[PDB]
């Protein structure tokens, strides 16, 4: 049996995650493909150069969870779409986590989050597909344990990629 | 004849103008096409309810100028290109000005700006032209005077429109 601790897709894009640095980086995007809107966190500073944009979740209560499973749903553009095949653009993003006994609120510090894994896409969406209203939606799941404190955080680091985070699900099994 | 006081197109986005509110609204964009880099200030917060985004230039030394002339080139997207294009989207932006004897720096008070005129496009670009890289670039020109202080500021106000500012040229006659 699955017990969901956090599901960004579920809530109507109202979680208001923390974004560093303030102003640039990730952003809360919206789309009307059906009468019901779709929410996501998109970033695409490709030809700008090297980028260090972080997106941190809310304070997730561990509960009695021992090992949690993190389901990501995202899209990544092909770097060959933009001027200059690479160096400018990247096709991956990093996943981070940080346990804490209490809510740090907006208190963010890069040095506190531990890198889980580089999130590579099974499919990148090409221009011809993207110029049409069809996108290749990737799915990647990671697990992490054992958790020890009352709660934890999740972070998403951008490194000059074109990524749209449609859905995250962190949960544990019974 | 024409002595230019400020030409945005000249500086390759080197200008870094003031944006308000801090972190949203007008943003400095880049368009590399056929290896010919083009820069612009653009905002397209069309469906995000009511907007009030401001773009102020740097302090321009008046000099012997008395009656200056302002030339703007821009692209405004047809509101019908967005679902929920009623009320939410606009097809114009505003041009303000302000006199000053000294560089106010970042001190931006929008209550100190007088309106010059509403800037409307002769040609709005529709999705078919936009997707085919055939955007239609409008050219509008206004004049303001007499200026009596050491310098002045030019301001651009978005109120819910999808505008791209590709060029400003301010000069006077001799």
């Amino acid at each position: 049996k699955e017990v969901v601790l956090l599901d960004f897709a579920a809530a109507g894009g109202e979680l208001g995650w923390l974004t560093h640095p303030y102003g640039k980086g990730w952003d809360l995007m919206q789309n009307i493909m059906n009468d019901m809107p779709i929410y996501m966190y998109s970033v695409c500073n490709v030809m700008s150069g090297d980028q260090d944009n972080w997106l941190r979740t809310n304070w997730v209560y561990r509960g009695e969870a021992e090992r949690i499973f993190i389901e990501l749903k995202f899209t990544v553009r092909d770097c060959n779409s933009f001027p200059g095949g690479a160096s400018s653009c990247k096709e991956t993003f990093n996943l981070y986590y940080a346990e804490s006994d209490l809510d740090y609120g907006t208190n963010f510090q890069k040095r506190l989050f531990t890198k889980i894994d580089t999130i590579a896409p099974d499919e990148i969406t090409v221009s011809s597909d993207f110029e049409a209203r069809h996108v290749k939606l990737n799915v990647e799941e990671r697990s992490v344990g054992p958790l020890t404190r009352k709660g934890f955080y999740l972070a998403f680091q951008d490194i000059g990629a074109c990524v749209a985070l449609l859905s995250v699900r962190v949960y544990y099994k019974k | 004849k024409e002595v230019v006081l400020l030409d945005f197109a000249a500086a390759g986005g080197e200008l870094g103008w003031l944006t308000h509110p801090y972190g949203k609204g007008w943003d400095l964009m880049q368009n590399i096409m056929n290896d010919m880099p083009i820069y612009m200030y653009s905002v397209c917060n069309v469906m995000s309810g009511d907007q009030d985004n401001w773009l102020r230039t740097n302090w321009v030394y008046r000099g012997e100028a008395e009656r200056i002339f302002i030339e703007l080139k821009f692209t405004v997207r047809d509101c019908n290109s967005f679902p929920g294009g009623a009320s939410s989207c606009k097809e114009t932006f505003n041009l303000y000005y302000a006199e000053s004897d000294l560089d106010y720096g970042t001190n931006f008070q929008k209550r100190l700006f007088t309106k010059i005129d509403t800037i409307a496009p002769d040609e709005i670009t529709v999705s078919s032209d936009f997707e085919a890289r055939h955007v239609k670039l409008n050219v509008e020109e206004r004049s303001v005077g007499p200026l009596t202080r050491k310098g002045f500021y030019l301001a651009f106000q978005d109120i819910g429109a999808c505008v791209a500012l590709l060029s400003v040229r301010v000069y006077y006659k001799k």
Partner: peptide
């Protein structure tokens, strides 16, 4: 865009 027809959301 990193997703077609995406507007900034409040």
């Amino acid at each position: 865009s990193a997703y077609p027809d995406s507007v900034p959301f409040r």
